[PDB]
Point group: C2
Chain length 241, copies 2
């Protein structure tokens, strides 16, 4: 019964994770867009002292999101929010019940975090070499069940953690968004279209097919336009090695 408010921005893959999980939970919740990169509201540190999106408030009196209550719980960090939503809505089965399968989900989220996420960030924002990213993606692909299905078999929060980033990759590459070189843009587009990456393309289609994705995605072109407003994606700059 207690209220959930998610502070969000369309470009943000980290906020996207949490919208997906809230959709999969069937939760009642409010979203509130925050111009975190160009015009942070003076009240925003009251909901997240770290000054990042996403931010979540939970409980307290029902108030407008730009008048946050000191009485709500302030929850930070998108992966903490995913686990919290699974904890709040156990009947939605956002994690498996089997401990080994639950560990597959947690392992997949840690493999993404520790090997892949930083490569996406370095390739896109610093234009570092794309090969290490493709290697990390091949490793992540190898953790998926071979025959189809999601990270832990049934859909879980592990798939909410990863799909925002993989789903952005394809249309960002098609639009030439990111500070990597033309040569590495071609390399990545060819790789991600190659038989080497058939399994992760099926994973992306399977995640995107779910209502939780359709209902939290502005569309490929609209997401590209949102991403173009991110300052660290300077138009017209590329790094070469």
């Amino acid at each position: 019964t207690k209220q959930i408010t998610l502070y969000t921005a369309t470009f943000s893959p980290y906020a996207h994770r949490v919208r997906i999980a809230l959709e999969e939970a069937g939760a009642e919740y409010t979203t509130y867009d925050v111009d975190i990169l160009r015009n942070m509201p003076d009240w925003f540190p009251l909901v997240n002292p770290l000054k990042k999106i996403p931010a979540m408030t939970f409980g307290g009196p029902e108030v407008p999101p730009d008048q946050p209550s000191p009485e709500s719980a302030k929850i930070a960090e998108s992966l903490a929010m995913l686990e919290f939503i699974a904890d709040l809505f156990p009947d939605a089965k956002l994690l498996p019940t089997d401990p080994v399968l639950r560990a597959r989900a947690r392992t997949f989220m840690a493999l993404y975090e520790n090997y892949v996420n930083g490569q996406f960030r370095d390739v896109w924002f610093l234009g570092t070499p794309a090969d290490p990213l493709l290697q990390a993606l091949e490793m992540l692909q190898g953790a998926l069940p071979p025959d189809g299905g999601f990270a832990a078999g049934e859909w879980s929060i592990a798939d909410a953690a990863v799909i925002p980033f993989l789903a952005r990759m394809f249309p960002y590459l098609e639009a030439g968004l990111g500070l990597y070189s033309k040569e590495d843009g071609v390399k990545m587009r060819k790789a991600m279209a190659s038989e080497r990456f058939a399994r992760i393309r099926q994973y992306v289609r399977d995640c995107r097919a779910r209502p939780s994705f359709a209902n939290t995605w502005a569309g490929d072109a609209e997401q590209v336009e949102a991403a173009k407003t991110v300052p660290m994606l300077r138009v017209g700059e590329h790094h070469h090695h």
Copy 2:
């Protein structure tokens, strides 16, 4: 009834995390040291194809750890192992039951992963300036309950995740181990002894006083000697300005 084997190494704070949680769970488990730095056994990629410590096997037939069975579950990534141990031993209450308190635990583990660990890595491996690390530690300190307790109040896996790194900081600094300069080492030692960091000192004391730490720690001098064998810590080497 299903067996647990943890592949470990004394120097490793990531492996230490999991040993602490296994102690707190009251689990029956085997540990097996692997010279992952210098002499990785040919069979080790069968338990962890990422070729890192820690590695875990679960279930399957009881076999010598250097003859791993294809029938055991192979679990990778220390934080996934922590959540797995919590799932396997619910009567041990390694997480709170309340969703908001559980979220404090998950948020603290993500704050450490996303803000603090990388700063420890930069300072210790590259000798980058200490100030950003001290800043990140003050942030993490701020997430603790100011008047006392562990990250989520009661002890949880969040404290298993973080104490290996905080507990190494003090004796590594007093040994001058790491690529930072003597000037930054003095600065860090003074900062961590000052009233600014009194709360995090209390936290380190409180975690170290638990049997789970005593039983998984070789002693400060012994741990320093094991750390001197780590190639990335470059014993005898320091970068300046």
